[PDB]
Every structure is written in structure tokens, then in C-alpha cells.
Amino acid sequence: VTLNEIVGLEDVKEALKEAVVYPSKRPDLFPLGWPRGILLYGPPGCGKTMIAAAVANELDSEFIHVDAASIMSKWLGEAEKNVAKIFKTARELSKKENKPAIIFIDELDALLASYTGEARVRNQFLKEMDGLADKNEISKVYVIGATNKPWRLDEPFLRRFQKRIYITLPDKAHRLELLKHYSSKVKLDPNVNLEELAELTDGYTASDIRDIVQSAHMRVVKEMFEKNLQEPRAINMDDFREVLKVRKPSVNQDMLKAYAAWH
Ligand SMILES: Nc1ncnc2c1ncn2[C@@H]1O[C@H](COP(=O)(O)OP(=O)(O)O)[C@@H](O)[C@H]1O
């Protein structure tokens, strides 16, 4: 998974290049240092995972994909042990290959939740993060965290991520490119208006949009199968309309401004 495979997020692409790629490739050029914690926050299905992997891939760095919910445990002492082990692994990958290591931690807010005092997982995580910054550390390790509930992160936690990037719902023009992108792979009737579809999909995420196209395709595929035909008819505008009547956005009303509030 590469950067060219991601439709929008040109300024996000830039920010991460700036935070990770450039200092990894030219450390001498950052005499004022750089942060090693990047936080991607926003609604789900907006490309957070995608973009983290797309930069690991750009740098050809070592990569560790972690789901924070997976690290947690209903027994004492396992969650902070798991945390310690991930960072250690990374440190060692980095020094062994003499190259940077990227840990992508998805569902970051999970570290703060109650499975069992939750403080002990937090404090270990906070210590590893401060450890990355240490000017005696030989390993070059970066942490890219993602959440769709940033309000669940406390402020000391936020202080370890000195770069913090809001990834929003796609705008009309973003939606149009996503539409163009996903629909390119299926066959459309000339009466189909991407422009109007762009407008009707306000509130919908990038994966929602993919799902809308998939779901529209399925109307024709289903038509072919149930009549035992060879190939399906092209997708028409009404097909999208019927999908839109029944598929509402993954992101409801308030959550959209929980996000802009916190941002
Ligand atoms: N900018 C984008 N361009 C192309 N596809 C996207 C984009 N954003 C999201 N997607 C699609 O949505 C899916 C979910 O994206 P993901 O990176 O997991 O979202 P997040 O991590 O923000 O919850 C991906 O498999 C991809 O199919």
C-alpha cells in the first residue's frame, strides 16, 4: 500500500513526509530536532491506517502494525508488558537494520480504557514515548497513533504527540474523486452524474463511498444472477438513489462536531 493509492490527503501526505521521511533521510538537516509522535485523529474509514502504511512503505522503513485493543488484557501486568515488548522490538529492528522503525498504533484510546487502576498502562506508554526523544537513544523509532475518539485521550497523553493531524470527512471535491476512483472499476450508464452523487454524499466517509459503489454494483450483479444472465446491465443513477435511501453515513450528527470541537 503506497501514497499514490490514496485519493486525497495531499496536505496530510505532505505533513507526514515532513515529520517522518525527511528527518529519517536527512537527520543533519533538523538541528532543532523533530517530534517522533504523530497522532492521526478523525472519523473512521477516512484513511488513517491507509496513510500510516503508505508512508512506512514510502520510506521502506521497518513496520509494526498494532491494534491497541489487542494489547489490553483483563489480567494485571500483561498490558504494560505487551507495551514494553513492542517498543523493545521496534528499537531492535531499527538498530539491527540501521533504519527507522514505524509503529502504527490503531485505536489508541484503547490503552486508556478499563479492562481490569488503568494508569499503569498509560504510564508505561508515556515512558516509552519520552524514551524515543532521548538524545542518547541510538534507535530511530517513530510512533504514529490513530483514534476516532480523541476526546478519550487525556492531555498528558496528547503531549507526547507533538504533531496532531485531523483527518476529516471528505469535502464535495474529495467525495467526487473518491467517486471517480471507485466507480472507474465498474460499468456506468451515461445518465450517471458523479457531480450530483458528490453532493448527495455529504456526511459520508471514504469507505462509506466505496461501500455505496459496491452496493450499487451489487444491484446489477444481483439482477443478472436471479435471471441467469451472462453479464449485468450498467449502473444507473437510480441504482445510487436506491442505495442512498437505505445507507446512511457511518458518522452521525453530533460525532461530526465532537470532532470539530476537539479539533
Ligand atoms: N483517501 C482515501 N483514498 C482511497 N481509499 C480510502 C481513502 N480513505 C479511506 N479509504 C478506504 O477506506 C478503507 C478504510 O480506511 P482506513 O485507512 O482503515 O480508515 P481509518 O484508518 O481512518 O479508520 C480503506 O481500505 C480504503 O478502502
Side-chain angles (χ1 to χ4, degrees):
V1 56
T2 92
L3 285 142
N4 305 6
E5 306 183 35
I6 309 179
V7 167
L9 321 178
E10 267 300 338
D11 62 328
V12 171
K13 290 172 174 195
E14 209 53 44
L16 283 165
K17 282 174 62 187
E18 284 177 22
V20 176
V21 176
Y22 296 169
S24 290
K25 288 183 166 176
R26 289 287 294 271
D28 57 288
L29 289 180
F30 288 77
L32 305 179
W34 58 100
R36 304 184 157 265
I38 302 87
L39 182 74
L40 305 187
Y41 65 98
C46 266
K48 283 181 309 303
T49 305
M50 197 149 200
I51 199 97
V55 58
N57 182 263
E58 178 83 321
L59 195 48
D60 189 67
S61 82
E62 298 295 332
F63 191 74
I64 297 173
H65 180 137
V66 203
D67 180 6
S70 300
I71 294 170
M72 307 308 286
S73 158
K74 305 158 310 217
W75 334 290
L76 306 207
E78 219 58 5
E80 60 267 37
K81 144 191 168 166
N82 285 337
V83 172
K85 195 186 279 195
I86 280 163
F87 279 82
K88 190 63 207 155
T89 297
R91 283 199 293 276
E92 293 206 87
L93 264 56
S94 181
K95 292 184 317 201
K96 203 138 67 62
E97 300 286 57
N98 192 22
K99 62 173 70 171
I102 293 166
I103 301 173
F104 168 68
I105 297 171
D106 192 8
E107 295 296 315
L108 180 64
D109 50 84
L111 296 172
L112 286 96
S114 307
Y115 288 79
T116 181
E118 297 68 36
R120 127 187 63 195
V121 174
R122 213 188 54 116
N123 292 10
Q124 180 68 19
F125 185 74
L126 290 181
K127 155 189 173 172
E128 298 282 354
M129 293 297 292
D130 304 352
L132 304 183
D134 182 285
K135 255 282 189 274
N136 300 108
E137 175 56 39
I138 310 321
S139 73
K140 304 134 279 190
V141 180
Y142 295 87
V143 175
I144 298 180
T147 186
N148 54 56
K149 317 182 208 83
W151 48 86
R152 279 192 196 182
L153 301 164
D154 53 48
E155 310 185 50
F157 204 104
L158 293 152
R159 205 193 307 187
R160 274 61 175 190
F161 294 86
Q162 219 56 295
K163 200 54 177 185
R164 303 210 289 270
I165 298 163
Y166 181 28
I167 304 187
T168 72
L169 292 185
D171 70 51
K172 306 246 191 303
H174 193 191
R175 302 201 300 274
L176 184 50
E177 308 316 310
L178 293 165
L179 288 170
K180 291 216 145 80
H181 176 80
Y182 289 117
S183 80
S184 98
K185 254 115 187 172
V186 289
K187 320 217 197 304
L188 301 176
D189 186 276
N191 86 334
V192 173
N193 206 342
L194 295 178
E195 300 179 338
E196 187 180 356
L197 293 176
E199 309 222 353
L200 296 149
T201 45
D202 174 63
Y204 286 86
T205 68
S207 52
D208 288 338
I209 289 167
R210 177 205 62 196
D211 292 348
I212 300 284
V213 175
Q214 254 166 19
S215 204
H217 179 62
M218 184 55 64
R219 286 183 60 88
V220 306
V221 174
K222 177 179 141 98
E223 181 185 299
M224 175 212 71
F225 268 118
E226 260 157 48
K227 304 201 288 192
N228 284 264
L229 301 187
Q230 181 60 250
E231 301 295 327
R233 65 167 175 88
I235 299 155
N236 57 44
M237 175 58 43
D238 274 322
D239 285 323
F240 289 101
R241 291 182 198 285
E242 293 300 315
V243 174
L244 292 172
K245 297 176 95 135
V246 81
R247 289 189 149 275
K248 267 217 218 295
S250 291
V251 198
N252 78 57
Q253 78 209 303
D254 61 74
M255 312 196 285
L256 181 53
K257 288 307 167 263
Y259 287 133
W262 201 92
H263 164 79

